[PDB]
Amino acid sequence: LGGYMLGSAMSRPIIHFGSDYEDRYYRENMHRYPNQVYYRPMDEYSNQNNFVHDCVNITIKQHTVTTTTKGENFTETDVKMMERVVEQMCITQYERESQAYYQR
């Protein structure tokens, strides 16, 4: 952190994974997960999934770095599980500004 911003929260997207235990894994903790996503307003670019990729990267990172500082090392799968959920949430947050773009 050093010049990053955060907007509104949302409900969880509920994305399937292919194991009821893998699914349950995040669901158990899904309220302490990054239910808010760090982004920057639209100006520089858009794309379909790439702004998400970027928003997701930082959101996941700042959670996981801080959570590693709080003694709680997440696996690659855990980061992959956030990377699904934070995508849907970064779609929602990306869009929550894309509406106002046309609203102008």
Tokens of 48: 């379909």
Count Cβ atoms within 10 A of the Cβ of residue 47 and give its class: 0-12 exposed, 13-18 middle, 19 or more buried.
exposed
Please give the CATH topology (third level) of the domain spanning 1-104. Answer: Major Prion Protein (1.10.790)
Is the distance from CB of 45 to CB of 13 less than 8 angstroms? no
Tokens of 1: 């952190």
Is the distance from CB of 52 to CB of 33 less than 8 angstroms? no
Distance CA 95, CA 103 (A): 12
DSSP string, 32-101: TS--S-EE--SSS--TTTHHHHHHHHHHHHHHHHHHHHTT----HHHHHHHHHHHHHHHHHHHHHHHHHH
Experimental method: NMR
Distance CA 82, CA 89 (A): 10
The domain locations on the chain are 1-104
Alpha carbon 26 to its chain's center: 13
